[PDB]
Symmetry: D2
Subunit: 160 residues, 4 copies
């Protein structure tokens, strides 16, 4: 790519490999190593993509947006947070997309790109969320806590 | 925890939540938010843990080691790389553990903790590997390439 | 402090040591190791402080602002950029404050806190500027270039 | 350069601009923007160079070494620490070079490239040291403390 690849790749059902690059693009690479397409964001893509059931590719960007990209490389939507999105998204069973932001919030975004809820931690959320079998969302914060957040966006507990 | 939680949590079969902390520990937290155990490495744990089929927890540390920790919090083994292990391990179908290192290599480590092979890129491997259906290992590098490596440790292709 | 001290300390004329912390504060510490004061910003202070000729302390914050703090620990002014200010400010002979931002610009800010000019690079400006004898401002960018900018904000040259 | 320029430039007496690059080189650039020379280290140069009284250029590398490079671009010596040297060196009145390392130590190195002392903190030393009028060396650590070290390498105080 044109820059450091710190983003961690994700693999689609047809074998397409998606990865972000410091050069600001989300890349879609065919299994044979040739470019399928590249999608330009406004900043470094350190966030690692996640792939929804319908093939939508979600990734954060240093330009403060969470991107939802169709398998053809055209934008589905982008959601603006208050700060760099270095956290990597996780997708719930109903399609909700969860991601942390440098602006200290954990975001829950509906598949349509509208905010479901946002939960304020005390510091940047660089950690990438994990979703439990019951739907609990776990994520670390720069504020030293591991958070457990219920599906409705309320604190379950925080572990110092 | 005692420090920033940049590591991304992983959830075990019984619901235990594992996460690293900048305070040098790998944490195991019960579903109720109470400590199960904390394992001290020699440096910040920014790497995100992966869980094997038998419940072993693998994570890298800034102290240059890849750790394999038993579900009870006791060390199974540790493997020394040449630099900080910020990359998050991936586990193959056969149990091979793949992880990047700041020393520029992608490591393949067998379940018993012995090196299978190491693949030298041109720069730090902070990207976390993904594994395709056919066993190909994909990982980004600070040298600007996305690498596709065969399970035998030989290059398939690299995408600038 | 309450968090990692990645910021690099600066020493005032009277020996006071100033440093930022990941806990969001700018610290002013007496030579005997006791707190003089701490100033809370909205986010991690990774930027390293610079000290003006009248003792004003300038530092960037993860909350996107460049801060000017009086020697007594009270805010003089804060200037909002479009992104995290990890770059460390430099002070020109005339008192102009130069600092990079995650929003890709090198900023020149007058002593009164108003914009003098902003220069657009191709990527995040984490590098901290240096000032030559003739006033040229040098800074690196995530876009791979070392920039030389004239005092009037116009490009002198860019070295790939 | 061939990669991101996160290193902060330093300016020599003749106006030469020195800066590290993520492409592993330390660059020396003439005031007119043309390359004077480049020196290859083994890893990314995020550390910001310092210039000694005699013109020696000191800089850390992600390859774990502190480099001393002569004005003509030839290696004078390199000093191996136990981890990445992202801290930027400072030079004391007697020529001692101080720098932090990811291996948790603050290093004091003699001008001949041999160890004077190293001081163990509780975590990675990414902060760049500053030197007070009486020779006290101040540096932050990932362990949350600002350290004040006497010139003999013994603790003066640490500020949480």
């Amino acid at each position: 790519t044109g820059g450091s690849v710190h983003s961690s790749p994700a693999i689609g059902q047809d074998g397409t490999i998606y990865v972000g690059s410091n050069d600001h693009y989300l890349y879609a690479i065919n299994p044979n190593g040739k470019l399928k397409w590249k999608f330009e964001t406004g900043g470094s893509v350190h966030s690692s993509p996640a792939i929804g059931q319908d093939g939508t590719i979600y990734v954060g960007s240093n330009d403060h947006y969470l991107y939802a990209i169709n398998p053809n490389g055209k934008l589905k939507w982008k959601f603006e947070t208050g700060g760099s999105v270095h956290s990597s998204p996780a997708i719930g069973q109903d399609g909700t997309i969860y991601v942390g932001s440098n602006d200290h919030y954990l975001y829950a975004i509906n598949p349509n790109g509208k905010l479901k809820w946002k939960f304020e931690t005390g510091g940047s959320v660089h950690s990438s969320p994990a979703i439990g079998q019951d739907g609990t969302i776990y994520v670390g914060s720069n504020d030293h806590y591991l958070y457990a957040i219920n599906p409705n966006g309320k604190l379950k507990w925080k572990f110092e």
